[PDB]
Design a protein around this nucleic acid. Structure first.
Ligand SMILES: Nc1ccn([C@H]2C[C@H](O)[C@@H](COP(=O)(O)OP(=O)(O)OP(=O)(O)O)O2)c(=O)n1
Ligand SMILES: [Mg+2]
Ligand SMILES: [Mg+2]
Ligand SMILES: [Mg+2]
Length: 377
DNA sequence: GGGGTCCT
DNA sequence: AGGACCC
């Protein structure tokens, strides 16, 4: 059966939140700073040369009058992240999150109802909100076109609600699966929406240049295909299956080629509460158990705060180390789930993990350490 | 780089 | 426990 999915994408997320936080930035070109970088920035400041994920030095050299705020505390950001998700769940319960500023909702059932309450008379009255991709002419006699136009209206409603109620602007993409919804949502930015009719499905996939532009084909898989002389969507569309299956495995091969055609049958998953929490830290060198201890203490500190709130409790903790990652994990003892000291017993366990994984007696060098709580009940 | 999902 | 993807 034919679905109707909507993808929602918040214009420069962290950027938006900062302004909404300190109005005294609305007028001013702005970049959120993570360490030495500018990971996002408002559109006002995009005009002056700035680009996502750019070096802060080059930044000001590109825009002397560039404000800077710190988005190394992702705390303000995820409150909004979930306010957005909750706002949308009120529409349809099934809402899939992707990162902090992206949402998928399945509108198929909500659309059928709107129509199953639409007098056969006013059927021609149905119209579109936002852009129709490739300016493709509407065909109202084609039920599929009808179910998608409604789709656009709900999206327009959702985008207005986000704005009126949360003050956030965003883009929307309405198509027949998550893949196309995602791709069509960025055709018109910022703060605008685009819908995709099926007859223009092939135009959209071919508009893509590098093969790694399709959601799902990431770093590894690209280099795999780039090696095979596969660079375009048509290259991939036309490549031999069997050779791909041999080279990528039947699981991947089958899926990612379907993707080259714009076929995606994966469902909108309900995300609900966060399955896990974590804090990260990378760096040039770390050759001591003791300073590992210091880091491991900090991270532990930061986590205990969210892990605190939430509600439900974590029943497993893990340790991750980059020297290519590797991890260890074990249940947290029953008496530990109890909040009045909790630190020292934790670092004790963590160190135990950090020692069976590493040979301390000998020299060692990590560029990254993480701590993760999960298995929440 | 710095969170989080899922497949296996 | 590790590997891939997403942002
Ligand atoms: N590898 C990455 C990718 C992005 N981000 C951060 C910066 C963004 O604020 C947020 C989501 O990235 P997006 O691709 O969604 O960018 P925006 O929605 O912020 O920008 P745009 O206005 O161009 O859509 O996550 C990050 O830290 N690490
Ligand atoms: Mg995005
Ligand atoms: Mg966006
Ligand atoms: Mg990709």
């Amino acid at each position: 059966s034919s679905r109707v999915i909507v993808h929602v994408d918040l214009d420069c997320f962290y950027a938006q939140v900062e302004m909404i936080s300190n109005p005294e930035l609305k007028d001013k070109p702005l970049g959120v700073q993570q360490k030495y970088l500018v990971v996002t920035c408002n559109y006002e400041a995009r005009k002056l040369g700035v680009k996502k994920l750019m070096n802060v030095r080059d930044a000001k050299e590109k825009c002397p009058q560039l404000v800077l705020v710190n988005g190394e505390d992702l705390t303000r950001y995820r409150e909004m992240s979930y306010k957005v998700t909750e706002l949308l769940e009120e529409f349809s319960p099934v809402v899939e999150r992707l990162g902090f500023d992206e949402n998928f909702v399945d509108l198929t059932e909500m659309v059928e109802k709107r129509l199953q309450q639409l007098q056969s008379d006013e059927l021609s009255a149905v119209t579109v909100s936002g852009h129709v991709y490739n300016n493709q002419s509407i065909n109202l006699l084609d039920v599929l076109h009808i179910r998608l136009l409604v789709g656009s209206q709900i999206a327009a409603e959702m985008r207005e609600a986000m704005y009126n109620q949360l003050g956030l602007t965003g883009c929307a993409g309405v198509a027949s699966n998550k893949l196309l919804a995602k791709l069509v949502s960025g055709v018109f930015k910022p703060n605008q929406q685009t819908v995709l009719l099926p007859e223009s499905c092939q135009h959209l996939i071919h508009s893509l240049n590098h093969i790694k532009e399709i959601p799902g084909i990431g770093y590894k898989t690209a280099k795999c295909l780039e090696a095979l002389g596969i660079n375009s969507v048509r290259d991939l569309q036309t490549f031999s299956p069997k050779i791909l299956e041999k080279e990528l495995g039947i699981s991947v091969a089958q899926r990612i080629q379907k993707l080259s055609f714009g076929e995606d049958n994966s469902p909108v998953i309900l995300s609900g509460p966060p399955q896990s929490f974590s804090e990260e830290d990378s760096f040039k060198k770390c050759s001591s158990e003791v300073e590992a201890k210091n880091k491991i203490e900090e991270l532990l500190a930061s986590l205990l705060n969210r892990v605190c709130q939430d509600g439900r409790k974590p029943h497993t903790v893990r340790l991750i180390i980059r020297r290519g990652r590797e991890s260890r994990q074990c249940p947290i003892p029953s008496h530990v789930i109890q909040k009045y000291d909790v630190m020292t017993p934790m670092v004790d366990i963590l160190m135990k993990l950090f020692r069976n994984m590493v040979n301390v007696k000998m020299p060692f060098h990590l560029t990254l350490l993480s701590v993760c709580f999960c298995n929440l009940k």
